[PDB]
Design an enzyme around this catalytic site. Sequence first.
Site, PDB file in Angstrom:
ATOM      1  CG  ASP A  31      61.746  51.566  46.295  1.00  0.00           C
ATOM      2  OD1 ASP A  31      62.239  50.502  46.726  1.00  0.00           O
ATOM      3  OD2 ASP A  31      61.678  52.610  46.974  1.00  0.00           O
ATOM      4  NE  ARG A  32      55.789  53.169  44.539  1.00  0.00           N
ATOM      5  CZ  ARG A  32      55.506  53.027  45.830  1.00  0.00           C
ATOM      6  NH1 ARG A  32      55.275  51.841  46.373  1.00  0.00           N
ATOM      7  NH2 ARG A  32      55.407  54.111  46.592  1.00  0.00           N
TER       8      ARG A  32
ATOM      9  CG  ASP B  83      60.474  58.273  38.622  1.00  0.00           C
ATOM     10  OD1 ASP B  83      61.280  59.141  38.232  1.00  0.00           O
ATOM     11  OD2 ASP B  83      59.681  58.455  39.569  1.00  0.00           O
TER      12      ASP B  83
ATOM     13  CG  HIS C 298      63.975  62.468  41.554  1.00  0.00           C
ATOM     14  ND1 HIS C 298      63.676  61.458  40.665  1.00  0.00           N
ATOM     15  CD2 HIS C 298      63.293  62.185  42.688  1.00  0.00           C
ATOM     16  CE1 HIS C 298      62.849  60.602  41.237  1.00  0.00           C
ATOM     17  NE2 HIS C 298      62.602  61.018  42.466  1.00  0.00           N
TER      18      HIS C 298
ATOM     19  CG  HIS D 290      59.953  53.169  40.557  1.00  0.00           C
ATOM     20  ND1 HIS D 290      59.396  54.394  40.259  1.00  0.00           N
ATOM     21  CD2 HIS D 290      60.350  53.241  41.849  1.00  0.00           C
ATOM     22  CE1 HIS D 290      59.448  55.170  41.327  1.00  0.00           C
ATOM     23  NE2 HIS D 290      60.023  54.495  42.304  1.00  0.00           N
TER      24      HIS D 290
ATOM     25  CG  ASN E 285      61.933  59.971  45.844  1.00  0.00           C
ATOM     26  OD1 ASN E 285      61.914  59.957  44.614  1.00  0.00           O
ATOM     27  ND2 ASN E 285      61.008  59.367  46.580  1.00  0.00           N
ATOM     28  CG  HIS E 286      62.076  55.643  45.507  1.00  0.00           C
ATOM     29  ND1 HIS E 286      61.301  54.688  46.127  1.00  0.00           N
ATOM     30  CD2 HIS E 286      61.236  56.648  45.167  1.00  0.00           C
ATOM     31  CE1 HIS E 286      60.047  55.099  46.165  1.00  0.00           C
ATOM     32  NE2 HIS E 286      59.979  56.286  45.589  1.00  0.00           N
TER      33      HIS E 286
ATOM     34  CG  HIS F 145      59.193  61.908  43.243  1.00  0.00           C
ATOM     35  ND1 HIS F 145      59.075  60.591  43.630  1.00  0.00           N
ATOM     36  CD2 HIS F 145      58.894  62.650  44.335  1.00  0.00           C
ATOM     37  CE1 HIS F 145      58.723  60.538  44.902  1.00  0.00           C
ATOM     38  NE2 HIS F 145      58.607  61.775  45.353  1.00  0.00           N
TER      39      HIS F 145
ATOM     40  NE  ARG G 286      56.093  61.804  47.397  1.00  0.00           N
ATOM     41  CZ  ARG G 286      55.946  62.996  46.835  1.00  0.00           C
ATOM     42  NH1 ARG G 286      56.437  64.091  47.393  1.00  0.00           N
ATOM     43  NH2 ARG G 286      55.297  63.092  45.677  1.00  0.00           N
TER      44      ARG G 286
ATOM     45  CG  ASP H  91      62.225  57.479  42.010  1.00  0.00           C
ATOM     46  OD1 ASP H  91      63.041  57.732  42.918  1.00  0.00           O
ATOM     47  OD2 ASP H  91      61.017  57.791  42.074  1.00  0.00           O
TER      48      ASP H  91
HETATM   49 MN   LIG Z   1      60.837  59.782  42.686  1.00  0.00          MN
HETATM   50 MN   LIG Z   2      58.929  57.505  41.728  1.00  0.00          MN
END
Ligand SMILES: [Mn+2]
Ligand SMILES: [Mn+2]
Lengths: 302, 373, 566
Positions: A87-88, A56, A166, A58, A116-117, A240, A213, A84
């Site tokens: 995000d973040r 990731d 992932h 991110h 997943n993102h 992940h 999660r 990924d």
């Molecule tokens: Mn992930």
């Molecule tokens: Mn992640």
Amino acid sequence: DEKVFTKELDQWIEQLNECKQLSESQVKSLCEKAKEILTKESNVQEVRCPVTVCGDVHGQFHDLMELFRIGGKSPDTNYLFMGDYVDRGYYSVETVTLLVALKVRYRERITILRGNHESRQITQVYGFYDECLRKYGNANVWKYFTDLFDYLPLTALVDGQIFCLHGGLSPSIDTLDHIRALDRLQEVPHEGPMCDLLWSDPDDRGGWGISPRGAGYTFGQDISETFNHANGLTLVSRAHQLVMEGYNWCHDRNVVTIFSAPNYCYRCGNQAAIMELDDTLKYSFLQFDPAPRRGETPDYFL
Amino acid sequence: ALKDSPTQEREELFIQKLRQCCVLFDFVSDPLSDLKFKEVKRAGLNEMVEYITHSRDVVTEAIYPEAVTMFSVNLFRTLPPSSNPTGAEFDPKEDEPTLEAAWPHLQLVYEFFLRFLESPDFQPNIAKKYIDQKFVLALLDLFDSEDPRERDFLKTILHRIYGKFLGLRAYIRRQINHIFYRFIYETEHHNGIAELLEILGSIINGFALPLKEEHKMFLIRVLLPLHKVKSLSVYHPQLAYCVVQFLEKESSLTEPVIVGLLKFWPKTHSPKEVMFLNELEEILDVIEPSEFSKVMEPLFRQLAKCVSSPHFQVAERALYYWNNEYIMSLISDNAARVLPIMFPALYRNSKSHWNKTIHGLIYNALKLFMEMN
Amino acid sequence: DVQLRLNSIKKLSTIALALGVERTRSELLPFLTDTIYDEDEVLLALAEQLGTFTTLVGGPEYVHCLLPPLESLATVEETVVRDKAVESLRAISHEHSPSDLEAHFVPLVKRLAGGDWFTSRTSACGLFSVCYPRVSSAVKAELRQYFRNLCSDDTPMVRRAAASKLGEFAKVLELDNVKSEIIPMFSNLASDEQDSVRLLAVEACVNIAQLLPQEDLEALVMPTLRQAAEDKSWRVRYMVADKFTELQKAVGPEITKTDLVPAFQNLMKDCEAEVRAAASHKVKEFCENLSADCRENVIMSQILPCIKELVSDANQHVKSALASVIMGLSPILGKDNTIEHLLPLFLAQLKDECPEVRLNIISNLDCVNEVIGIRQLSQSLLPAIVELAEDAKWRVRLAIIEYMPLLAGQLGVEFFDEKLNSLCMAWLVDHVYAIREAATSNLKKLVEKFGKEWAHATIIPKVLAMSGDPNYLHRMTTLFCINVLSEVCGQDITTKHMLPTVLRMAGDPVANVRFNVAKSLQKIGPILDNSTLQSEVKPILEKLTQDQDVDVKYFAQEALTVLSLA
Ligand SMILES: [Mn+2]
Ligand SMILES: [Mn+2]
């Protein structure tokens, strides 16, 4: 493949390397070209033996440069990401633009998977839609990127000995043929094999368990071992999951979680690692620290 | 110990105890230094707390100055630099609180002061010449502390001080207004906004029915601008409660409040937009039919964009307005000019959405609109 | 519509240009003054637009018509538009004539300073300096009176603004009035109940001491400066420490020895890590700017014993700040003092556990190299540098690699070939690509410094034997080294020693090395002789053009095009 188009792509990559975003029309054209390129890979991707595997990112663009400095430049060193990207992070748009541009320009050298993102719901819940709004004034580039994220391959297979994905395995998946049978040209469902491939995690509980999660399952050492023996695999590289050391070995060294975002969320303060596979398929881990930072409007203004 | 001591030097023993615990110890550099000296002073503080809440007629005029002085030396200080990093890439809701190292003593001091304020024999007339504007300012300066328990204790102490001291009311309100002005316009960083807003809401609950120009201007120019800050999600419930409290106190401010909320409507912050929708619904459940007709045009012009936004969370939050029977009923009362503002927005997103729950909600809202007229 | 209105307000310049010079004053300006009151976005755009209307309004003689709308626009609550309006007002005030300055602008600032709300007062606080030195004596005096009123105002926000602008206002006032009016208000601000105002008073103290004669500085500013240095607020102490250099430069060389040296010692010996780091940041410049007659003595007696303790400070930021400048005072102390005292400190900081500290302490090694002899350097710090050349932190390794060419050139070829060639060659097979390319660049610098024969005799076989490395990263590393060395080794060496290796390795199984070979052949192509280019280079390139990869084909075609072998 065309001359001036490739030159413009190289110019785009060089501009992106300076943490500079592209225009909306440029992003639209790049997304269309990436959709045409990615429409012709199966669910599993065949990757050659010499390649570097990264986890990731991110949206940490300076951190991704640091990763490139550690592991070599994009054209010289084969790379393989497992999702990924957005995000973040404060530079999610730049990160995804650079990675997708590298995929388009060096399709035989860059292999980007789906995390997943890279889904509409998660990217709306977290800070990538807002990031795109802030950087562009509208929600067109976000739509283009989310539409492009649908065509990303779910998994990858390097030398038919390493499985790259992932999230992890699923109760409904047990064979690479079954993985190939899935349909990926859609938004990730809330449940099912495709959702499970990008949302699962490993643990030490044994058997299929409920994911804390909220999506996916949790698979154990026995599950990983039987999957490996059935599919003829010796290693399952995954992502992940955040790990302090950057890389982690689980299930008697059958699966490995690789995280390439040190100082996660600029708060965790962890290290990262990348997996380098040489000609003879021997793995090596390089750990690196976050890049140094140099050079230290109202919300209703629009 | 006090309890075993005779009754005629009690005040002197108490004053000796308050003279004790005024010395400050160190918890950061060395946490195992002077263990006996720390334990004896902690025992003394606990003995004071137990005594002042059980014994009666034990508070004298000579105890107030020693109490305020001990509180001043123990607590009035300059806050350390914030450990949480500051910047545009850091989420204000993700800042891990930095716990105060000297809590085993600060908590006892806070408890002692709270019991002293809440003591039945506490005399405000005598105590007002020691607790003054400087003391209030010093207490308010500590609201920026990063310890949540310290902030809670300070909030309780400030509430008690305002409730019991009539002469410091205007000064406290002005100082809180100054702190809010600084936070809004200069710094945009303050850990005690939630506690200050809780205090201000408890303040609002007791306002006079003929609302004053000072309070009206305070609402217009302090509470309303507080909605534009980036860290609004930290204290949104308290600000919404204060706004609703003013709305219920005086219904003539609904139009200014709503036109201010629409003015500060976020456009690059989906959680802020969701919070704005939540607060707008909360305001609307208590709006008057006559006043709604005066702001409904801008209200529904903004609601159309909220419904038409691609963000699924804000879309569903705007669509959930239909489940409230009041808003729908008063929509019918203004249907002749509510229909053409919102009909195109609902019709144009009949099937143009990536989410199917949004499709179901939009279809339900459209059928409710059709059955209306 | 908000966006259309924003664009129209931005094009207000073009609209007013199309409008006549008199009618843009008769209708357009009153329309903006009266009708418009809207969102902060359009208000800010109007504030920006009104800042350049001096020439469009009819010249300096009639610019006073921009005062009505600017005054109403400078009291807006938001700060982003209020600041733009205030800079617009400052800019406009310059073109005002002295005759009408006291008739239209002074009344405007008088009204703004008397505003009911704090926004107007804060806006007016920034307009005193641009209109003070051009008005008459009575108007000045009343301006000073109203500035004092603003400084003694109830609201801490406008008190903050006054403290911020006090120095700028005092820069334009005569000496006698500064001694009599500015000083008492500065002292009052320095004793405010708010540290956020005390620190601004501290900052203005430097500017206040700048224009005063040295005779009365001790009796006017200095007790305030001392009480600010010993303030109970860590923020005020930090601001004093940050501005210590400017304070020393202002005060004058004499009073520094008397009082600032103890003040600096106290600041560096403070229980606050941030203040300690800020004071350490100036620990070189303060020593540099000392009086020449006793610079060495004062440093040796006051500063070095203090920085000896700072070296081992618990916090990391203070250590990094001190290490960033610790060699800054080596030439001042001299050779004997350096070898006696600074060298153990340099070694301790080189052996420190902080990567930032190690990077900073290494980065200034040339400064100490120019003071002590190269023999002393090689005797003392060479074990430290060779030990750190294998440090776990690739940033430190990069810094050492960057320093390496100068050290090798100073040491000499006999020393280098015996005690640094192994390290330099081992840098080429490191796990970090940045370190590998830095090693190649350092190798180019070394060959430039030492000549072609030394390379051909010592390092060319070493880098040529690397082409057999099973790792394709290290295989391309050989291509990078050949690329780097070709432009320096000369045509003879290039065509006799590293052409065969590239030509043979052009058939590597890995497409990455395969096309890197094409890139290297393209780059080093001009250095080669034409006979070699046509006889041994072309066949391998045309063989590579038939490869299955697309990237290899593209790079081979590009090399053919640029190299003129098509
Ligand atoms: Mn992930
Ligand atoms: Mn992640």
